[PDB]
Design an enzyme around this catalytic site. Structure first.
Site, short mmCIF file in Angstrom:
data_model
loop_
_atom_site.label_atom_id
_atom_site.label_comp_id
_atom_site.label_asym_id
_atom_site.label_seq_id
_atom_site.Cartn_x
_atom_site.Cartn_y
_atom_site.Cartn_z
N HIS A 1 26.94 -9.59 -44.60
CA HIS A 1 25.70 -10.42 -45.22
C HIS A 1 24.70 -10.39 -43.98
CE1 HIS A 1 28.56 -13.39 -43.60
NE2 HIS A 1 27.89 -14.07 -42.84
N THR B 1 24.02 -19.81 -45.66
CA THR B 1 24.79 -19.16 -46.52
C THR B 1 26.51 -19.93 -46.80
OG1 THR B 1 26.24 -18.40 -44.34
CG2 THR B 1 24.52 -16.86 -45.18
N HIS C 1 18.07 -12.64 -40.15
CA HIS C 1 17.72 -12.61 -41.51
C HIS C 1 16.51 -11.71 -41.86
CE1 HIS C 1 20.71 -15.76 -42.90
NE2 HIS C 1 20.36 -16.16 -41.71
N1 LIG Z 1 22.62 -18.67 -41.55
S1 LIG Z 1 23.64 -19.77 -41.01
O1 LIG Z 1 23.96 -20.92 -41.79
O2 LIG Z 1 23.70 -19.75 -39.62
C1 LIG Z 1 25.26 -18.67 -41.33
C2 LIG Z 1 26.72 -19.01 -40.62
B1 LIG Z 1 27.17 -18.81 -38.92
B2 LIG Z 1 28.93 -18.22 -39.08
B3 LIG Z 1 29.58 -19.59 -39.91
B4 LIG Z 1 28.47 -20.00 -38.86
B5 LIG Z 1 28.34 -20.74 -40.61
B6 LIG Z 1 29.16 -19.78 -41.60
B7 LIG Z 1 29.39 -18.17 -40.84
B8 LIG Z 1 27.72 -17.49 -40.30
B9 LIG Z 1 27.85 -18.28 -41.65
C3 LIG Z 1 27.36 -20.10 -41.46
B10 LIG Z 1 27.00 -20.39 -40.04
ZN LIG Z 2 21.15 -17.67 -40.63
#
Ligand SMILES: [N]S(=O)(=O)[C]C1234B567B89%10B%11%12%13B85%14B%1158B%12%11%15B%139%12B%1061B%12%112C5%153B%14874
Ligand SMILES: [Zn+2]
EC number: 4.2.1.1
Length: 257
Positions: free
Chosen positions: A61, A196, A93
């Site tokens: 992603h 996400t 992104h």
């Molecule tokens: N755009 S975002 O919300 O920062 C993406 C993520 B970073 B890692 B874990 B940490 B949490 B989940 B995984 B990537 B997805 C969410 B955060």
């Molecule tokens: Zn992000």
């Protein structure tokens, strides 16, 4: 599975993650005239001098640069935050063309890309616990516009050919994320979510007003990444952004007049 395509993209995510229709979802449009200047907001403290980058990874992603978060080496404090937040990773992104790619918008303007530096609150001990708390994460968001190159991004750009497809990772030590920061730390802030899945409502958003400039050649290299794994039909990793979600009466606050 989720992704960004017609059949699995943002409009589908609520089926597996019903919080997608929640009360504090991200990103949002930042209406600059409605955001209120809050003179009680502190300057943001970004302490990245001792940051230890570890790996760069294509997760299907985005791509992410991961840091050692086992000690207080790269921390975010101050601003709207109470306590100390450790840098875990950064990622981006971006769009298929320069007129889209950002997740946050500013008076409906979309930037070419958006950088997220993800930090978690040390009072919860690990990121998995932090994601279950309303003040668990602090994400520093930085807009990218296309013009002059960002020298501090080039080290990242140059290794992307080694992580083309979902799965792939590489050593990525000694990367200094200070080289990705604009001059000003003026910011907007509001309570929100991950953008996400799992879309957890655990994020204090800190979105910097000043974009960084990157070159067309730098963003073109982002656009050569693939969503797919090696051996699968090639699908360019482009337009990996969630659109703006309803504000639902939350207040966006400005650190600046
Ligand atoms: N755009 S975002 O919300 O920062 C993406 C993520 B970073 B890692 B874990 B940490 B949490 B989940 B995984 B990537 B997805 C969410 B955060
Ligand atoms: Zn992000």
């Amino acid at each position: 599975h989720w992704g960004y395509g017609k059949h699995n993209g943002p409009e589908h995510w609520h089926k597996d993650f019903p919080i997608a229709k929640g009360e504090r979802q991200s990103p949002v449009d930042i209406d600059t005239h409605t955001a209120k200047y809050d003179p009680s907001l502190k300057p943001l403290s970004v302490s990245y001098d001792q940051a230890t980058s570890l790996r760069i990874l294509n997760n299907g992603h985005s791509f992410q640069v991961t840091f050692d978060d086992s000690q207080d080496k790269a921390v975010l404090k101050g601003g709207p935050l109470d306590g100390t937040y450790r840098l875990l990773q950064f990622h981006f992104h971006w769009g298929s063309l320069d007129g889209q790619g950002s997740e946050h918008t500013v008076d409906k303007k979309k930037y070419a890309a958006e950088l997220h530096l993800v930090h978690w609150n040390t009072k919860y001990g690990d990121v998995g616990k932090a994601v279950q708390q309303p003040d668990g994460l602090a994400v520093l968001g930085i807009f990218l516009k296309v013009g002059s190159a960002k020298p501090g991004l080039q080290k990242v750009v140059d290794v992307l050919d080694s992580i083309k497809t979902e799965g792939k990772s590489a050593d990525f030590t000694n990367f200094d994320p200070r080289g990705l920061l604009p001059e000003s730390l003026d910011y907007w802030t509001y309570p929100g979510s991950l953008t996400t899945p799992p879309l957890a409502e655990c994020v204090t958003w800190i979105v910097l007003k000043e974009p960084i400039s990157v070159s067309s050649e730098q963003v073109l290299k982002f656009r050569k990444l693939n969503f797919n794994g090696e051996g699968e039909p090639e699908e360019l990793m482009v337009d990996n952004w969630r659109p703006a979600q309803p504000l639902k009466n939350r207040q966006i606050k400005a650190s600046f007049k």
